[PDB]
Each structure stands twice: as structure tokens, then as C-alpha cells.
Amino acid sequence: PVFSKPMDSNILKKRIFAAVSEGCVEELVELLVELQELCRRRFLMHKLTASDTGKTCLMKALLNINPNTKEIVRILLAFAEENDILGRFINAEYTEEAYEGQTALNIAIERRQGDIAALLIAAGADVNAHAKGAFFNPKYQHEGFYFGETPLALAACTNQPEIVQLLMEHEQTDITSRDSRGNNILHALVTVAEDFKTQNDFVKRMYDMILLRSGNWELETTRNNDGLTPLQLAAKMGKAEILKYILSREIKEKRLRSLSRKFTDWAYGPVSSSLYDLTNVDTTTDNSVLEITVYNTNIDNRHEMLTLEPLHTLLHMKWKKFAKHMFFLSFCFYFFYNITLTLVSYYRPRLQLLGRMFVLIWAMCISVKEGIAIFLLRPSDLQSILSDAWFHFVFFIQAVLVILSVFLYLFAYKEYLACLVLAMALGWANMLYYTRGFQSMGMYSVMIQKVILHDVLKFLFVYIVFLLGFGVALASLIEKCPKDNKDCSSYGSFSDAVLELFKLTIGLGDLNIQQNSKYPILFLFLLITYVILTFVLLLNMLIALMGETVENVSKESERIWRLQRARTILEFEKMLPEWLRSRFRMGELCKVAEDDFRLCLRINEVKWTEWKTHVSF
Amino acid sequence: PVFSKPMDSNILKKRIFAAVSEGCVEELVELLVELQELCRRRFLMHKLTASDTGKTCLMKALLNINPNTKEIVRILLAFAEENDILGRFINAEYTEEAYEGQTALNIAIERRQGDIAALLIAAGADVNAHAKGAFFNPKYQHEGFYFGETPLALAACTNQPEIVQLLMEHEQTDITSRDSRGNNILHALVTVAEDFKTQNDFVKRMYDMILLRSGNWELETTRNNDGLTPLQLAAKMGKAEILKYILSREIKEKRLRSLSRKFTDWAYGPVSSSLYDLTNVDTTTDNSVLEITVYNTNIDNRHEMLTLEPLHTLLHMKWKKFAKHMFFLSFCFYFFYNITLTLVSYYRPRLQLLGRMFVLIWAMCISVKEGIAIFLLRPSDLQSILSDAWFHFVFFIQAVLVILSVFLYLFAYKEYLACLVLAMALGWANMLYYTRGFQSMGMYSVMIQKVILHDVLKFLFVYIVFLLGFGVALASLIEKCPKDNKDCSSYGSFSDAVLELFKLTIGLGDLNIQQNSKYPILFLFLLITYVILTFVLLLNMLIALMGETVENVSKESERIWRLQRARTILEFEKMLPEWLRSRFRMGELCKVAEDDFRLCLRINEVKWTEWKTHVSF
Numbered sequence A, B: 001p002v003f004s005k006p007m008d009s010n011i012l013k014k015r016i017f018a019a020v021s022e023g024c025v026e027e028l029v030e031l032l033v034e035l036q037e038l039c040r041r042r043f044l045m046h047k048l049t050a051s052d053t054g055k056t057c058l059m060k061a062l063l064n065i066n067p068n069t070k071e072i073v074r075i076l077l078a079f080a081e082e083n084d085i086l087g088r089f090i091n092a093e094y095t096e097e098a099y100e101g102q103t104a105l106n107i108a109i110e111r112r113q114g115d116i117a118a119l120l121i122a123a124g125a126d127v128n129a130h131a132k133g134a135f136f137n138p139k140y141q142h143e144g145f146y147f148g149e150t151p152l153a154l155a156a157c158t159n160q161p162e163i164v165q166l167l168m169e170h171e172q173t174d175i176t177s178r179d180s181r182g183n184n185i186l187h188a189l190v191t192v193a194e195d196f197k198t199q200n201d202f203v204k205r206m207y208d209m210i211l212l213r214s215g216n217w218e219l220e221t222t223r224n225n226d227g228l229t230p231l232q233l234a235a236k237m238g239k240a241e242i243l244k245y246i247l248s249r250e251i252k253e254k255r256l257r258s259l260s261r262k263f264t265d266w267a268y269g270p271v272s273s274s275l276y277d278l279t280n281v282d283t284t285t286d287n288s289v290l291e292i293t294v295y296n297t298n299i300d301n302r303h304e305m306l307t308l309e310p311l312h313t314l315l316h317m318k319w320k321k322f323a324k325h326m327f328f329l330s331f332c333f334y335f336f337y338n339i340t341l342t343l344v345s346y347y348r349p350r351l352q353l354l355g356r357m358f359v360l361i362w363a364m365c366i367s368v369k370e371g372i373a374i375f376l377l378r379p380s381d382l383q384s385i386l387s388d389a390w391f392h393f394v395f396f397i398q399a400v401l402v403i404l405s406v407f408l409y410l411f412a413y414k415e416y417l418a419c420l421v422l423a424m425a426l427g428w429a430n431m432l433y434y435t436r437g438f439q440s441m442g443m444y445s446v447m448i449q450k451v452i453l454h455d456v457l458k459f460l461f462v463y464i465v466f467l468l469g470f471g472v473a474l475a476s477l478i479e480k481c482p483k484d485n486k487d488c489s490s491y492g493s494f495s496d497a498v499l500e501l502f503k504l505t506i507g508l509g510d511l512n513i514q515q516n517s518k519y520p521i522l523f524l525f526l527l528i529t530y531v532i533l534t535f536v537l538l539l540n541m542l543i544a545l546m547g548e549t550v551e552n553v554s555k556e557s558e559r560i561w562r563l564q565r566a567r568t569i570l571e572f573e574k575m576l577p578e579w580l581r582s583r584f585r586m587g588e589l590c591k592v593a594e595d596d597f598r599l600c601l602r603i604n605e606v607k608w609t610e611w612k613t614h615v616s617f
């Protein structure tokens, strides 16, 4: 990455800056006596700070910590309060593009100087001073560190709970404060949080602290600049631990019960009927966590992300309620559409007229749905290798070719077999999408979807750049026969040599040495080295490479089948009419202070291994 | 899963119920003074309990434990004994379908309230109050928790030995009590027990406690509702640790010697001749543990389940006594029957008449045995992939086709070669069952039995749905020749195109471009993409998939060969006559109190690694 001018370097006002660097208080005593009357005519002490970047000696002293630093800070504060400029001195900000709005308290917090940090707030800091800068607000994740550009989140993004308690007891803190990105403190903790369970992580523990110290719902209901309360921000950023904690969170103490999400009912040993609350989980309005966690591409930790308590049961109930009954209906009504293509294609005209226009209207419906589905998606969705747009595009082609054929048939262009036969061969090959069910058979289609995109195009490109060179050479090595007989020089042209040299790869045809070549010792050399270099090397090294690929992705297939299952589960939801949406879940709990707690789904989960380990002691 | 109305919720009699919920004794003082004369006219205190589910305030207070709960229980008991309804109050039962017969002591035990549990039995509990309900007695294993529906097993199914001791010293406990499922306490411990050795498990330790406190044989000889003393219940449910403990169990103390099963004789270092007792182990009557552990499908922990001391030696002795000598006899007498089919099939009539009806009578015997064997099995046995019914069905077909052929031969239908040649080709292919012996060769047949059922039908179905679409398209792309020559359009019909397009897959035949097609650029595209998509992708991705399958199941083959070996060992037992069963094991030990301890098999086992590790200290 790149940055602007540095915040500190070591390449008569510079003498104070050099004195506060190493922290020489004995040297720092006398220059301030000199500075009290240094050009005391009128300047309004602007020479105390620097004008190139807005730096003062305070944040320069806190920029590099030495064992003697407290005396420097107290001497600087005692000097600043003499000239009645302490408010302007402690509220000093950087004035560059990378760093803008940076205060001395912001640097004091991050240097683990909790004892020093109490001094600036005692002198009076604005606290709410944002840090809107290019460094503090990076574009990607590799040119800076992000912390919500608020000083309170410094003690939150870095494990400093004592400064969190010190800032909480302040009268002017503004816990419900936005920023330039519109985030809040909980959004900041969501962003810094670590997805994988890597032993102890302070973010999950400190979320409880900040939320219990808030004691209200405004911190978890405010939206981002795009608009995201942190429940789905933890989903989009790919944070499994934080989402698991926020989805299943209950407070066993009174006076804090509205913040709870998982109201337990009874714990009868291995069984525990937990009444879960869902308000941004079910796809009711938009941007639900269930919708975000399935329409995402960059997430790699979806092994454990989909199998939470208010998501797995929700998906299973949706599948058993309205997804399987329509999946089988779609399978039957597409198999019939593919079968009625055989009665038109194979039985072409070289009372069975009831199905002549059924294929036309169903191709029209398929096209008018896939045209919406292909532009509703963004180009970022196709960047993933296992994207769902490939089948959405194949299904679209299967409709455009059919409608083009039936358009050209009655227009009499003699092309009613050009696009209809390709539509046929693609439609029978399109049946490997409706194997989303049948778990054992569903294991098999993603092997296609991964192997063909990982090993087939690479070996195909190598074999194409291999066959092209040998094809030109073998066609150039032969000689033109004097046309006394037509059966001369079987490797006649480049197009014929390509076919005759490709037939040798599969294993059908014949091999000859008298191909009207004046250099048989050279013809045979090339013909032998082609089969040696490709059939002995490439055709079986491909097998060896997929022997590693399938071994690597055999344990990964279980989650990637369930991903396609959940995607086609939620895709059929959008196709429902609004009046058919009456089959919602259980809701209107009314077990809160003065309202109804949205919708609350009752699940009855059991865990016998965990209960066996717990009861073992 | 689903459930009935919940046992507790938080959505002038309800005030007492709310007071006992959080356990506010200071609030609980005055309402009872109010309730003493509340409508004291005559109701016979029915308002103290609820009528919707039969709940009282006692089990509601024990439903959620708070640090102050003992005073609530003692105040409720002191109030109930005043109105002389303590017996009806403490013997209160739930009255719904899911929960029926549930008492307050049952809820007090499971909440780890051992100090509270002594109070209700001191007041007087019926103890033997069953919990016959749909929740306590689930159908499958995923809609409830099962514990034998007796309160004594609550302290047994949950690790609470102190309450076991408290219930044992009671005068009215009825240790030999059945239930609605006919189980006993040992059956309950067998059901809850954990099969794999997962560090410490309280069930195996507490079995010793309950059996030594019983001190008799009635607890381990009572049968289930179907009829199972727990030795084979531990076998059918798949519990390796519990079965290992119960099979090899000895008490070194006097006054408890009839309960012992493994009477040791001498321990001469690495060798220890252990005299084992077998009463429900040998297949003498029915339902032996050895018979149950081999005729089971759902068990996955049979790696260590078959190799116990009174089972492995029993199987080895049976094999060396009467199973190998009949296996070789069956192999010879079936190879002769398959060889004498060649002298009839290949030498058909387009003094060798001694073998013309031998095949007929042996096919009759094979059919009359396989017809019994195919309906003696249940449909649950065929659900397993590696079931023994496939060979039992192939052997049956090999007899029905032969008898149909020899029936149609002398009836003169000219079909004596239609079913006889298929019977021949199936009979020579049926020889891959008699490779149960030859350990290295026996490793090879289960590779067939697994690979063909896991990878062959899936790739075959994909290749069939692939070849069918290209077959119709390639046959439709060609044009009908004007019949001036017969050698026109080699891809003539669909049936011919299927064969010509299948010959390209194996690698024999020829490839041409002038197939009387008006669209050669389209014919060649389909012909090239078929070989690309199938021979380059499917035919070798199958190899890559079995490269993972064989690697995964290479370590699993050792147990699955021995499973077929034990199954064909015990299958030949049933074929023996009753008079031939005189070759039993050693029995009539008479080393017990006043009887003969059934049969007792002497084995001489050695263990040098264990003795080397033991003597090392």
C-alpha cells in the first residue's frame, strides 16, 4: 500500500519537538521558561504547534512511549492552562488527507496508556471527535486499520475494557453516535471481529459488556449508510462466532429482558424447548440475515454459518412446507416439456396437435423468468466458481433456441432444425440441475460443476495449443499427389489433418506410414511424439490431477450441496404471490414490556452428546 | 419435532403460581393466609392446583430453581399437612397426552436437587409412580428423552448416585418393576448408554452399583415387551462398551458369585485360562447375543463388537468344527453343478445321460432353499447397502431360470436357449460369492459389492441421460437418403444412432463426417462435444471418484469380510439336523450354589503386549 507524509520521523521551535521525543524532562524544564517570553509581542502561541501536519508536542510525546512520560504530560497541561489555551491545545487535529481529525486522546488510548488517558478527559476532551480520514477509513482491507473512527471504539476495537468503563461513566459520551460511514460501535466490533474460533477473542465477550452497559435497543437497531443493523452486518462480513452469539443471546437477569433473543421455556435434560425470536431472520421485508447468508459469494466459513438454531429449523420448515411440493411439480412439468420436444424433433415432417404450442408457451415463460433472473444478479455474483448464474443462463439459452426455432419454422427459412436440435441436446443435458434433491445423487452434480471448471478447460487449452501446432506441421510435411488418384495424402489439408490426428487420441481409426510424405523418418517422429506427449502424459496426468482434486473436495461437498439446496429453497419464495404468504410462522408473543415482540418461533431442539458430557460431572 | 402445550410459560389463583415462579417467600407469606379462608365454604381445595394440565405450585417451583427454594417447599408442605391433603398434593400427576403421570419428585430428581429430593420421600411419595407419556416414551430417538419412565432410573439415567442410594434404602422401592414398555432399570441404562469409549461414562460404572445393590439374578433375567434380557438388548441397540462389560464380569468377593460371568482359573503371567460362562451366547434356543450381533444392519460399531472373548473363540471353534468342512463341500458341489451346465448348454442337440437331471434336482433344491431364505428376511435387512439378500436373490434367479429352461425344453416352445444361456452367464458370474474364504481374495469381492452400488449406477444413470439426448439429436440431424443406395445415413434411426454413438465411447469403430447431414458444422459440433463431455470428463472422473472411495474403504474392508464370514458361519448352523446338534460346547459346571451354571466354555487367552505393559511397573 501507499501513505501520505509520516506521523513521526527523526531526520528554534524544533528543539521542543526533539525534547518531547525522547522525553528529557530535565532538558524540558528550561526551554518553556524561554518560550514564555519568546517573541511575546503580537503571535498567539501558534509556534507551539506545527503547521505542516497540525502536530503538537502532546501527541508527539504520546506517539513514542518512554518510561518517563507522565511528567511531560502534566507539565504540558500545567503550561497550557496558564495561557488559557488548554481547550484549543487538547482539541488539536491532524490536517492531512490520510489523517484528519486525529486527537491526542485517540493516540493515548491505543498506546495502552490507561493511566495517562484519564488525564486528558480530566482536562476536558471532546470525546466525540471523529477520525474521518483515508487511513482510518480504507477502501479495501489492506491499506489501513478501521475502528469506526470514534475514540470510544479504540478501547473497544483494542482489548481495553478499563477505558470503556471510564468513557461510559462520562456525562458526554453519546453512545448512539453515527460516523462518516454511518456505523455505530456495535458495527465496529462486528467489523474487527474474527470469524474462526481462534481460542479467546475479546470481541465476543466485550459485545456483552457494551450491550449491557447500553441497556437499550437503539444500538442494535440503527442502520448503516447502506442500511444494516449489525445482525446482518455480521452475516455479510462473514462472522460466524458473532452471529452465533447474537442469534442465541439471553439475559437471565431482570430489568434487562427486552435485549434477550432466545427465551428458554423448559430444560428437561437432553431436551430444551427454546422459544427463539425472529424479527430480521425470516424473509419478511428485505435484507434478512437468512437471505444475506445464502446470497453471498465471498464467505468461506459457511460450513457452520448456515447451521444455527433460528436458521436450520427455519429452512427445514420452509422445505417441508412449500419448497419440496413445488420442486417435484417443477421437475415433472419440466420433464414433460423436455419429453414433448422428442415428439416434435424426432418426428419432424420430413390428433397429436395438443402439444405443439405447449413447448412454445413454456419456453416463453422460462425465457420471461430467466431474463429477469439474469439481470437481477450483479456481476459480483458470477465471480464465484460455483455460482448459480450458469444454470440460470443455460436455462435461458434452452428457451431462446426453442423460440427461435419455432419462429423460423413458420417463417420458412429452412433453419427449423438448426437451433431446435441444439436446444434438444442442451435440454436433455440440462437435467443435471434438477438433481438438487437426492443427497447421494446430489453429491454427484457438484463434482461436474467443480471438475469441469477446474481441470477440463486447462487440459483442453493445453491440448488445443498442442493439437494446433502438430496439425499445421503434419499438414505441411505431406506432398501434393499428382491427382492421378483421389485417395492420396490422407493428411491433405489442415482441416483434414486435425480430424485424422484427433482420431488417434481417442483410440479409433488407423495409423499408416505411407501418407505421400517425402520424409517418412520425420513424419513418424512427429506422429509418435504426439501420442507420447499427449496420450501417455496429458490424458492420464489429468486423471492424476482430479485424483487429488476429488480427494480434496470430497469433504467439502456436504456444505456445497446444502448451499444449492438453500438457494433453490429461498428462490421459490420470491415466486409466491403476496396472498399466498399468509403461511407465516408463529408470532405476536406479547412477552415483553408494553408491545408484541414481533414474531417468535418455537423450536424443540435436543442434544444428547452435550447433555451426556454435562451430566458426566 | 413437535410437542403439546408447554410445561411452563410466562405469558386470583394465578398470583400464587406467579409467586412460586421466582420464589418470593416474603410475597409468599400473606397470600396463603388469604387462601386459608378464600371461599372457604363448600370447594375442596381444587383451586390450589390447575385444571388445564394438572399442574400445582410444587412442581412449578421445582420447574425453575432459584437460590431460595427450600423455604418454599417446606412452607408448601407445612401448609398441605394442615388441610390433611398432603397425600393428594404430593401425588399430583400431569394430565395431557405428552406428559402423563409426571410427579413432583420426578422433576425434583432431574434438577440435581438431592437435598430437596429427600423432603418429598420423607413426606411420603409413591416412588413407583410411572411416567407413561408420549414425551417420555418417544417413537424414534429425536422427539424426546427416554429413561424407563420410573423415578428410580432418573438418578440412574442421570449421574446422581446419592439419590440411587437414598432410593435403595427405602422400604418401598420395587427394584424388579416393569413399565409400559416392559423394561427394567438395567434395560434403561442399556438404552441411555454410549457405545463409543468417550473418556468417562457413568453408565458402565453405575451398572456395577445397581447390580451389586440388587445382589440377585432377577434384574438380568427379566424380558422386554418383545422379550429381551439386557445381554442381547445391549447387542441390538449397538452398545460395545456395555456388552464388553457384561460379557466379561467377575466379582472377586464372596456372597456375590452367582452374578459373575468370567470365572478365572489361573493367571500365569501373559497366559490366563479364563473359564467363560455362556447361557444366552451360543445359538442354543433363540435370540442369542451372537445371533443378534451378526443379523443386524444399523450397527456401525461392529469393528470391536464381534471380537470379544466369548464370541471370537466361539466363532473360530464353530468354523474349525463344522463350517469349513461344509463350505468346501458346497464349493465343490456347486462348481460341479456349474460345470455340468457346460455339457448341456454348449453341447446342445443342434452314455453321458447321468448328469442330465442332476442340474434339475440341484436347481430344485437351490430354489426350495432360497425361497425360504428370501421371505424369512424382513425388508429392514435389505435397507443396508452390503446386505446378504442380493446373493440370496441371485442364487434364486440362477435356479428359476434353469428350471424354466428345462421345463420349456421338453414342452417344445423353442425357448430352451432363451433362459438357459442367461442362467449360464449368471451362474459363472455367481462364483464371486464363494470367495468368502481366502482372506486376500476375500478382500476383493467386497470392492465389487461396494463400488458397483456406489459409483456404477450413478455414472450409468448420468451416461444414460446423456446418451439418450444426444441419440435423439444425432438421429434427428441426419437426412433421409433417396434410397438409390442402401449404405446411406449410418445414423439412420434412433436405435442405430444409439449403437453407433455408444461404439465411440469404448474406442472401437470409425468416425466419419459425411453422414448424409445437411449441417456438417452442427453434426461435428455435437459429435465432438459428446466425446469431450463424456470420455474426457465422465469416464475418468469415475476413476477419480473410486480413487477416493477405495482409499476410504480400504481400512474398512477387514471388518466387512469378517462380517460375511460370520454370517455364512451362522447360516450353515440353521441347516443342521437336530440330531447333529450333539456337538455342543463344554457345560454343566456345577460351580454355583445349588444348581449347574448352564454351559461354561473354557478358553485359554494370551496377551503379551498388555502383560508387558503391566509388568513394566
Ligand SMILES: CC(C)=CCC[C@H](C)CC=O
Residues within 6 Å of the ligand: A425, A426, A429, A430, A432, A448, B529
Ligand atoms: C454438465 C453441465 C452442467 C452442462 C453441460 C452442458 C453442455 C454444454 C451440453 C452442450 O450442448
Ligand SMILES: CC(C)=CCC[C@H](C)CC=O
Residues within 6 Å of the ligand: B425, B426, B429, B430, B432, B448
Ligand atoms: C459381480 C456380482 C456380485 C454380480 C454381477 C452379476 C451380473 C448381474 C451378471 C448378469 O448377467
